[PDB]
Amino acid sequence: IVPFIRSLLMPTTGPASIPDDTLEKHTLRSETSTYNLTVGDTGSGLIVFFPGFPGSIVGAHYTLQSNGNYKFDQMLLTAQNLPASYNYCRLVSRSLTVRSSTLLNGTINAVTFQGSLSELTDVSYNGLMSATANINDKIGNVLVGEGVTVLSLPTSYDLGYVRLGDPIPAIGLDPKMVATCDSSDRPRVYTITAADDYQFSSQYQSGGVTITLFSANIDAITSLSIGGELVFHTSVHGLALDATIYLIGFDGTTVITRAVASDNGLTTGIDNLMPFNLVIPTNEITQPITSIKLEIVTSKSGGQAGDQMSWSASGSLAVTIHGGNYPGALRPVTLVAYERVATGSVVTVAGVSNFELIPNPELAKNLVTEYGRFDPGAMNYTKLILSERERLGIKTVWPTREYTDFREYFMEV
Amino acid sequence: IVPFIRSLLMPTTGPASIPDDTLEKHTLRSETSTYNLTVGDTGSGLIVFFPGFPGSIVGAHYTLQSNGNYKFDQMLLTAQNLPASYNYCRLVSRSLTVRSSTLPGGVYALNGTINAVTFQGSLSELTDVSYNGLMSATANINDKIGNVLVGEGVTVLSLPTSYDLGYVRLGDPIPAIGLDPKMVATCDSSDRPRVYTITAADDYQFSSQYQSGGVTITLFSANIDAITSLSIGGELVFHTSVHGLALDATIYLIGFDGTTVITRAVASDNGLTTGIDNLMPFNLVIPTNEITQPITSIKLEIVTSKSGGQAGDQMSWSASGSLAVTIHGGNYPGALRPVTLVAYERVATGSVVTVAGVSNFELIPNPELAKNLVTEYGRFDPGAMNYTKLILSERERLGIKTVWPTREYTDFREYFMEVA
Amino acid sequence: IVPFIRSLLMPTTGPASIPDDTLEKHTLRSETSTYNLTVGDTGSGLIVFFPGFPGSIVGAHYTLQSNGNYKFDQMLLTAQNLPASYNYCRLVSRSLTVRSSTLPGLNGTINAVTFQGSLSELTDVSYNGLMSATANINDKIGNVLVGEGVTVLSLPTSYDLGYVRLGDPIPAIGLDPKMVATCDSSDRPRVYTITAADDYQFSSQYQSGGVTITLFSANIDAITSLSIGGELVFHTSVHGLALDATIYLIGFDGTTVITRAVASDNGLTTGIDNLMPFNLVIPTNEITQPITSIKLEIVTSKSGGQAGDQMSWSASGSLAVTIHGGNYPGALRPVTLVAYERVATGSVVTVAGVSNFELIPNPELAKNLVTEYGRFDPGAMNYTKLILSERERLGIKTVWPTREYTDFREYFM
Amino acid sequence: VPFIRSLLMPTTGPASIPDDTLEKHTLRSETSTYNLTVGDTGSGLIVFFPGFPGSIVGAHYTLQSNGNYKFDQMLLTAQNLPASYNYCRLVSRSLTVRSSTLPGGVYALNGTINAVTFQGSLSELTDVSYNGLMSATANINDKIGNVLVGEGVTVLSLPTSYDLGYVRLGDPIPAIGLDPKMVATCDSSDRPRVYTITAADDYQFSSQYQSGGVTITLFSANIDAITSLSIGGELVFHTSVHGLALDATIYLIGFDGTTVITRAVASDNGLTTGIDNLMPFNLVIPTNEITQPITSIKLEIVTSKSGGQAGDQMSWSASGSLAVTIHGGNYPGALRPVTLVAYERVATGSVVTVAGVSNFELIPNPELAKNLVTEYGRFDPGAMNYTKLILSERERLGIKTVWPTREYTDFREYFMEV
Numbered sequence A: 001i002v003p004f005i006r007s008l009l010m011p012t013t014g015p016a017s018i019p020d021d022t023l024e025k026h027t028l029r030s031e032t033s034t035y036n037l038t039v040g041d042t043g044s045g046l047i048v049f050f051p052g053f054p055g056s057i058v059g060a061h062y063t064l065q066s067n068g069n070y071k072f073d074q075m076l077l078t079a080q081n082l083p084a085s086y087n088y089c090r091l092v093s094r095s096l097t098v099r100s101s102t103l104l105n106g107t108i109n110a111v112t113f114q115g116s117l118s119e120l121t122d123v124s125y126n127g128l129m130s131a132t133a134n135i136n137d138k139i140g141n142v143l144v145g146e147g148v149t150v151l152s153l154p155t156s157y158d159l160g161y162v163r164l165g166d167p168i169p170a171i172g173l174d175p176k177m178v179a180t181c182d183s184s185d186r187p188r189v190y191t192i193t194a195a196d197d198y199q200f201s202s203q204y205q206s207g208g209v210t211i212t213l214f215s216a217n218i219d220a221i222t223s224l225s226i227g228g229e230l231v232f233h234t235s236v237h238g239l240a241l242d243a244t245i246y247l248i249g250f251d252g253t254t255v256i257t258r259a260v261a262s263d264n265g266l267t268t269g270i271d272n273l274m275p276f277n278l279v280i281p282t283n284e285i286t287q288p289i290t291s292i293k294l295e296i297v298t299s300k301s302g303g304q305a306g307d308q309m310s311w312s313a314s315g316s317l318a319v320t321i322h323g324g325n326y327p328g329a330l331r332p333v334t335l336v337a338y339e340r341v342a343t344g345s346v347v348t349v350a351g352v353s354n355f356e357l358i359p360n361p362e363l364a365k366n367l368v369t370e371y372g373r374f375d376p377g378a379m380n381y382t383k384l385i386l387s388e389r390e391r392l393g394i395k396t397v398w399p400t401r402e403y404t405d406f407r408e409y410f411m412e413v
Numbered sequence B: 001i002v003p004f005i006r007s008l009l010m011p012t013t014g015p016a017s018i019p020d021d022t023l024e025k026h027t028l029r030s031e032t033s034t035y036n037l038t039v040g041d042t043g044s045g046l047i048v049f050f051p052g053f054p055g056s057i058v059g060a061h062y063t064l065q066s067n068g069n070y071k072f073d074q075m076l077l078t079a080q081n082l083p084a085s086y087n088y089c090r091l092v093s094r095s096l097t098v099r100s101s102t103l104p105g106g107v108y109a110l111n112g113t114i115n116a117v118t119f120q121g122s123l124s125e126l127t128d129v130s131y132n133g134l135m136s137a138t139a140n141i142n143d144k145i146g147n148v149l150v151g152e153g154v155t156v157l158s159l160p161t162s163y164d165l166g167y168v169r170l171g172d173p174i175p176a177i178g179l180d181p182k183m184v185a186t187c188d189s190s191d192r193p194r195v196y197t198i199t200a201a202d203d204y205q206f207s208s209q210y211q212s213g214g215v216t217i218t219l220f221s222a223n224i225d226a227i228t229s230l231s232i233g234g235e236l237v238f239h240t241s242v243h244g245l246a247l248d249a250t251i252y253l254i255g256f257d258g259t260t261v262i263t264r265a266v267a268s269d270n271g272l273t274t275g276i277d278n279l280m281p282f283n284l285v286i287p288t289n290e291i292t293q294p295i296t297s298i299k300l301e302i303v304t305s306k307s308g309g310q311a312g313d314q315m316s317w318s319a320s321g322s323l324a325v326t327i328h329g330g331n332y333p334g335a336l337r338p339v340t341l342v343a344y345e346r347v348a349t350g351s352v353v354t355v356a357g358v359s360n361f362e363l364i365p366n367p368e369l370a371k372n373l374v375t376e377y378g379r380f381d382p383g384a385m386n387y388t389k390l391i392l393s394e395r396e397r398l399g400i401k402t403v404w405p406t407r408e409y410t411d412f413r414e415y416f417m418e419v420a
Numbered sequence C: 001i002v003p004f005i006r007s008l009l010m011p012t013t014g015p016a017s018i019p020d021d022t023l024e025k026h027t028l029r030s031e032t033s034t035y036n037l038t039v040g041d042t043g044s045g046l047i048v049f050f051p052g053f054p055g056s057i058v059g060a061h062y063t064l065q066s067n068g069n070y071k072f073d074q075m076l077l078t079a080q081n082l083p084a085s086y087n088y089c090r091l092v093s094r095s096l097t098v099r100s101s102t103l104p105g106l107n108g109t110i111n112a113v114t115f116q117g118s119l120s121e122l123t124d125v126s127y128n129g130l131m132s133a134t135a136n137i138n139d140k141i142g143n144v145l146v147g148e149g150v151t152v153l154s155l156p157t158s159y160d161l162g163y164v165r166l167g168d169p170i171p172a173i174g175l176d177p178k179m180v181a182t183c184d185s186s187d188r189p190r191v192y193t194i195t196a197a198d199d200y201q202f203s204s205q206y207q208s209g210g211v212t213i214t215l216f217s218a219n220i221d222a223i224t225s226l227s228i229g230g231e232l233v234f235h236t237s238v239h240g241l242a243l244d245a246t247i248y249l250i251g252f253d254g255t256t257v258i259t260r261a262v263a264s265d266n267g268l269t270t271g272i273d274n275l276m277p278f279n280l281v282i283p284t285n286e287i288t289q290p291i292t293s294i295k296l297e298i299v300t301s302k303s304g305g306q307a308g309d310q311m312s313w314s315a316s317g318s319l320a321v322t323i324h325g326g327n328y329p330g331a332l333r334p335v336t337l338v339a340y341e342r343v344a345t346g347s348v349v350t351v352a353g354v355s356n357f358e359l360i361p362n363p364e365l366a367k368n369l370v371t372e373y374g375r376f377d378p379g380a381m382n383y384t385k386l387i388l389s390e391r392e393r394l395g396i397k398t399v400w401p402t403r404e405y406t407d408f409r410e411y412f413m
Numbered sequence D: 001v002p003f004i005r006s007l008l009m010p011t012t013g014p015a016s017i018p019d020d021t022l023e024k025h026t027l028r029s030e031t032s033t034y035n036l037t038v039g040d041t042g043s044g045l046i047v048f049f050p051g052f053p054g055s056i057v058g059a060h061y062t063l064q065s066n067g068n069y070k071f072d073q074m075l076l077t078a079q080n081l082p083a084s085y086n087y088c089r090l091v092s093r094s095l096t097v098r099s100s101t102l103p104g105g106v107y108a109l110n111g112t113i114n115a116v117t118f119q120g121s122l123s124e125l126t127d128v129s130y131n132g133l134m135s136a137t138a139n140i141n142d143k144i145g146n147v148l149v150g151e152g153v154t155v156l157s158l159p160t161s162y163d164l165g166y167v168r169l170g171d172p173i174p175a176i177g178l179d180p181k182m183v184a185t186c187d188s189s190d191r192p193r194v195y196t197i198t199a200a201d202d203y204q205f206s207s208q209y210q211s212g213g214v215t216i217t218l219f220s221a222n223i224d225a226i227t228s229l230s231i232g233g234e235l236v237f238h239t240s241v242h243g244l245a246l247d248a249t250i251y252l253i254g255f256d257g258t259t260v261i262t263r264a265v266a267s268d269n270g271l272t273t274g275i276d277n278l279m280p281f282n283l284v285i286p287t288n289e290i291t292q293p294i295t296s297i298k299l300e301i302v303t304s305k306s307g308g309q310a311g312d313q314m315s316w317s318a319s320g321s322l323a324v325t326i327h328g329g330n331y332p333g334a335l336r337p338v339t340l341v342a343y344e345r346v347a348t349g350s351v352v353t354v355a356g357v358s359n360f361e362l363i364p365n366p367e368l369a370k371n372l373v374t375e376y377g378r379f380d381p382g383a384m385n386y387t388k389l390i391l392s393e394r395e396r397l398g399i400k401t402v403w404p405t406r407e408y409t410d411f412r413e414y415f416m417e418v
């Protein structure tokens, strides 16, 4: 039987080279993921998986709080940090199982959504059953003790190798200095026109008046840039602006704040320029970002109760998520939700990720790389299997008992 | 016969999945395009088609004016705006026919001819866009067609510019709320950007006698191409020995018809301090909804002024700097190149030039539609790609054109449905 | 025989279309490369080749100086400048031979290796050090006699690569005769993210003229246009301080290739966020030799100051260095190094090669150059995959002692 | 296979449907021929009911300068089936639309057509403009764009289910009455369509007196009807004000916005304070009163106070629901699907010519039964499977519901050879 197909459908058996046309000298590796997550007091929670992520980021766990909000717990990664040993990567296959081990203890709903985290319209335990219309991309009310298996299915082949966000040789006065070469090919770009002759008007107030000009859903796991410019016009004298950008997490928490304008004084009758020159590095992102908002504070230094403060603005920003549109980098997303699990129980996660990799300079001295086994009918066979996906029942989310049966039905044929 | 081949060569029969290695779960759709364009007073005009555009923009119509300049009429799109229902797209196949359908009351004689050609570059790269000059835009005999009767019509057939192309983000709206009711937020076509680099000045010396109101110059003008969002960055550094000088700088994006599509202030009353590097950064983002017609050039204007100046004293400065124009997803094959031009002349004024076609796509639904639209990997068809490669390699022998006199394309369709 | 395989393994026989799925109407061309390089007084040197470069840049020659440093000699290009006639390109195959052709008044050996990273990533570039840059026995060759020479053969780093924009000039007019405008290689950018400071504390006693520091230095790679964006934010309690900041791009030989002012007499206001944006664009025509590092200099000054006056500030910030089209396979990696030593001073090291391309003509040439999809050859790709997978068994090298490569050619014909 | 021939080429005549609805019947073809006149905008719309089980083929509307459509006339079959038959089933049908003339002053060609088959009924379309129609369906074989009017378009009726029952034709029944204008028919009834509307749920109405009463429209809803329907239900009115009286009328509006039928549902109905005032409807709208397809219904209420004076108050609260039953409305083909043929830029005064054939399975009325033999119909073992095979390969075969006539003609040849 075809190694690649075996690897694709049964990732835990090991890696195999993707039988496409991306002929690069590489090496094959398997990285395990093991976590024992703790259940909060509502007995409900959510694990967000990035099934196709080309690297060490596997997912994020959130617990549902009594007030109905989610709260970030932690990231789910591979056993080792790939960027420390390799510079390029391609995902070959992956599978993870989620089940309670601190065992009749609750149920799981799981779905594979074709967009990115912030694009979900409903993330409730029952709402997720509608995120996709594909019957083989959703699974409902599986007992937590039996568990669910997430299987990564392709979102395109002939994908390029991805830079891993590996550190680069650098020295600096600051011991907290960080330098990396980031995943960049195939950037995702968001364009936000925040104002088109927007008129702001308000009575003076010591300390100024704050407004949130806009708030938009965006997705980011790794480095991103925010560029652009706002132009302000005013008839009033003595106004000064303070502007700040906030990147918010899925749990509503602020993840990043950046000053864009500080005591920026406005001159009457002229175009007042407010540029954006922001770069958010990966190490600063502590949990997935799902929204961005801009705050503007208007103030009049020598003002007094009664003066009117006003200005008009026009402008657009561009948010670039480096490598964001690389299939698997932000989309798709597989959600595994659980409810009614006894508080304090352990939700156990166990999986394998298989990659095609290019070693970093030091490791390259000892790691041989090759083009990889020629297998003439491997791709055709894969295309045949995936086109017959519904007839064969190949799911992205499975009740583990069924996936196990599926594995037998495959090895004994 | 191989459904993909049938869709490729006869787009109006419907869509089919591209038999390459880009295995994504998707859905297949057909969008029609129907337009009844009006002929201006010169009886001449030009339709610019973007045969490989991965989305709803099919082309643009320009009428030729008596003064010899073109004038933008309107964009030609698909029946519905794909970005409103889908987030990702790939072009499978497309064909459009152009022919006259009317004669205003009074004209007894039908008149008019069409010249059409497929140019492997983007709009602003054409060296000649006159009715007869187009015939030389390419050397490939199967990518040009001349003097076809307007009443018979021409058929534009989209031929591949590479397979295994990735899905493209459609410029779909994202969830957002704002104080401004005119606020707009989208996720744009970005993979494979096109980048233009312009060194506007390398120690350029500017010198001129003061003048109330300032002195204006146009530092440079360059041809670039943009249909959707783009950004402009970089910087100009100014040096001066004169005191009291201030600069005003503006960027202009010009359309194919010479008109200004977009203007952006880059510098406003920016004072220049002597014996210091004066910095003028560019931080411009031009969203898609602001581009009303294809952009074919960019130019930079600088206004030098001396507030407390009088007739007689000299104004001057030296500058150095570069800008980078990034067209988001601009180099995605089909996004800007290639271009198919259909020119017509001698058509009775007031007649109707009718456009009708179909576009076929592989699409990924937006979140709301994904709740009701099933997506799949798509029929396995073992020899479809080989057959496609064989047909295209024999393109000249088989006579598969990108532009056809419609009668011939119709004959070609029959000769195809018989042999298969 | 399958044309493509013949072209791939024996580039000097001419071009052939790559049998992948990138179906573009194109034309095929061969560009030769010929150089007679002069050996310096140490008798030692280094030629850096970009085997997969999609265009006219073939390599760079450096001589080793008595003091142990390298010194840039010149670039190695194709006979004609492709961007002047074509706008898009893909590399089909390439091979170059390096051998001594002169005696002034035998001498010397060559070590060569193909490294899977880019120039600045090499950990050791000495004649002997190179032998360990890779672990692949077929990507290194040692102590070949210079008179016999070495042959560098370009092997694929992925197929189904897109066409690359060539950096061709665009129509433009300007007041400055020195004005330059091009459309650059851009798809698949490489991005470096550098966090230069995270509340970095700076402090020093005044000094007429200012105190200079080099905040950081990092290795990066660039051959063609790149851009630098981002921002530094400065805080200070002292009054009257002003900053000057400069970016330097350094070449492989340690020399300064490019310098850009980022801040000039930028005064710092107390108790506020002082913004220092980066808006640099470095055009290809300004890069005279490969860039291997970037550093930032900051000069702090207090105009009206006197001994005892203390100058201090804290800073935070990140920059993003974007190398346009830098991650396109072949544009920066891999690199093939050919080092020679003990060659008589004043000798001629002769370089001779052929580069084969798929090209799309510029507008003017398109009027007379016919383009086509290219020969259908059903099993060409499979055969290529088979050959590359049996690379080790067949002994297909990226660097060869020329005599062996010649025997290999016969054994093939 | 005769059935297939009839289904794909209706003009060749009728054939029995090879399903399981074994009834003794007779087979007939009824032609449709119309010469429609183009209005001053040069634009118009013909609405076809491709699957209608009877003589109603369609309706023609012209587009007016103000942007609204104006009803011209119904398109029927040569003869009125209900006059000779009592039951019916549609076998197959096709119609062509093309211009056949030129108002003097124009000499070559003028006009284009957009056509589409929508799977809903008329009022359910979201956009009926010339260009908007192109999106009514996502099926490429159910739409056709910018066909030259001189060449024409062909509408081909494709099935919306088989094993459909026979439909009563709305035939007259023996009846005598004192009124010469009396009418009695047995209507299409099987498979009614039903709309349920809640017009008010404690709605508060409040207004100042006014001579003649104060009028309001409680609700307005899109519904579809071509033949008889009934409207039943009840409104309940509560009030604290004494002396109030209500007048309530139901309006059935046509596709062109005009009122087609009105029925009083309350006349001078006085409201008693502190009690539930009931207002029951029992409206039966017979087919002959419906002059053009109905696309909406609205409820008008006039509140008055006979002995009131300026400054007097009028208020009440209301609750109510109604059921609109379209007899036989959900019978497949009766209301849905619909095929729209839109034309524009046609010279004013030109003639848009319609020509088609409808094939039916029929059961004669009592008088005709005396002379018309009926039978079960040819046994054709594989006709149904062949039909199912052709329809499943619809996209591969290119079998359209709307065609540029030249292509349909080519399609006919390619079939008569194979």
Ligand SMILES: [Ca+2]
Residues within 6 Å of the ligand: A020, A021, A158, B020, B021, B164, C020, C021, C160
């Ligand atoms: Ca491929």
Ligand SMILES: [Cl-]
Residues within 6 Å of the ligand: A184, A185, A186, A187, B191, B192, B193, C186, C187, C188, C189
């Ligand atoms: Cl890219």
